[PDB]
Amino acid sequence: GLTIGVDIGGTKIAAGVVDEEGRILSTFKVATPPTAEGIVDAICAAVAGASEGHDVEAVGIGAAGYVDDKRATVLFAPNIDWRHEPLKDKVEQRVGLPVVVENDANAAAWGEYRFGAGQGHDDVICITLGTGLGGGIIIGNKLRRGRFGVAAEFGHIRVVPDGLLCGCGSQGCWEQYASGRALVRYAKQRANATPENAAVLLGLGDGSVDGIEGKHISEAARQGDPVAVDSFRELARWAGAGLADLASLFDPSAFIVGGGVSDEGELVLDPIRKSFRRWLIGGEWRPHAQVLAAQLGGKAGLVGAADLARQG
Template identity: 30%
Template sequence: MDKFIGIDIGGTNIKYGLLDEKGNILHKDKIKTSPEGSEIIRNIKRIVESYKEAHEISAVGISVPGVVEESGFLTTGGAIFDFYGIHLKDLLEKELGVHVTVENDANSAALAEKWLGAGRDYRNYFTAVVGTGIGGAIIINNDVYRGAHATAGEFGFMINAPILNGDTRLASVSLTSSVQSGLVQRYLDETGQETNQQNLDGESVFKLAESGDVQAKAVIDAFYDHLAIGIYNVLVSLDPEVVLIGGGISANQSFIKELNRRVQGLQTGHRDMKNMTLAEILPCHFLNDAGIVGASYKAMKECRERTLVKGGQES
């Protein structure tokens, strides 16, 4: 059975795993992400060489932040500034000696759902990853839709709040609707607490609201409204079969239920939309493993496509 390596490069950790062609994770681990691009490349080489000692590796799939061209060229690299403007696929293939695929992290998460997760029964859907920031991916006819400049699905850049002092970024979905900025930082700002407050996360803000904290309740209310507006705009623009929400917060069923209720409320408030059907919002199946599973799936797909092309040429 063919073996594939999935590597998910994040701002904090590099998660990696060995998968078979059925999607079984045979081994997985993680290491800290170096701020140096050259060190990241060296660590990837160590990971792959370690797996090669005991396994025949068919291909390596890489999941990265930033704008990724279909060719594997990185226009941007998220928080990894050394990855801006490099052809990561070509570079890694020379270093590793195996076929390599490179994909945006949100797209990788969406592909994981397509392969073995909540997107298996859908041809057209939208995935939003709600975490420290906001990522998004569009699947059309079972494949990633990239757009003209490989930036389709960048949900976090959408504007869903009034623009103050010309600062478009502060009015974007990533700042109003992410767990870090839309919940934690906003709560700290509203209460006048220090921005480096220890142990405060999104779950903490929800618990404060449950205990009766009025400001926490107001922050959560605004968070839901902003996120619902962003998703509503996607629903009426793309008309997907379903919207899948990823990130740790998606494991909270009450969060998914309330988000659906808010979006339905927006539809109810629009008299011309009463007979229209909007897609349901569901949680993603994969959480922390989404990147390595999706990257492996892309690598596996490309391997099979290359084999078919080669077989056709030989015949």
């Protein structure tokens, strides 16, 4: 039958009814509230909104945090105020439907494996670029959550010793260098330094550096705004180097890049792919994985979460 998927990210909540073939039948979006209690309210509003007109059997939540092996509790989140949050229990008692809670990028990996760019592969690795950087692991045709449920937390691999402060409480985490937030940071740095090379970018906002938004950077880069193009170059430096490290770790047939910015397709995927190829160890002597945009784009997580609910 039909289930609902709800993707709860640091910035946005998105929900939809999803059928057995991963077709999205409805859309609901709302901003992620700042408190755990407000988030439960918003989840309920999202489920109610997306469910309009449809007979719904279960709810799958893709949550932006460390989710336990029982798929019920958000143990820890760097960019949302969740600490040992019993999300399954709270949502079940309010919506009156069975709920499964999965990590958001685990869910995106699953969505792409079933219905997107991972179809036909056995071993694929997903990264999502958004508020943070999430990971998802498909090995031997199965999602791998690890012993304690918290595998694929790629965003907190240390890429710069003693580097940037992260929401997780550590320093130098990959997500501080490769994420939608990092992209925005790169563009604001560059627009502040050389505003004369950011005219198009600034014109898409309110004209100020502070008014630069992720989607502006994408549109401006399409139009050839040098500062926007350079910001994507910097994002790709770190995203591609990290994908090369993931090739050393997992050696998959494909990497699948999701998150909101993956909606931009080759605009972001081409520099990431080129960077991956520059960083891949062993030069000419070893094979290279494909580097692919999430076919479902930013919706992969809600689709995968919906489908993971259906297999409950």
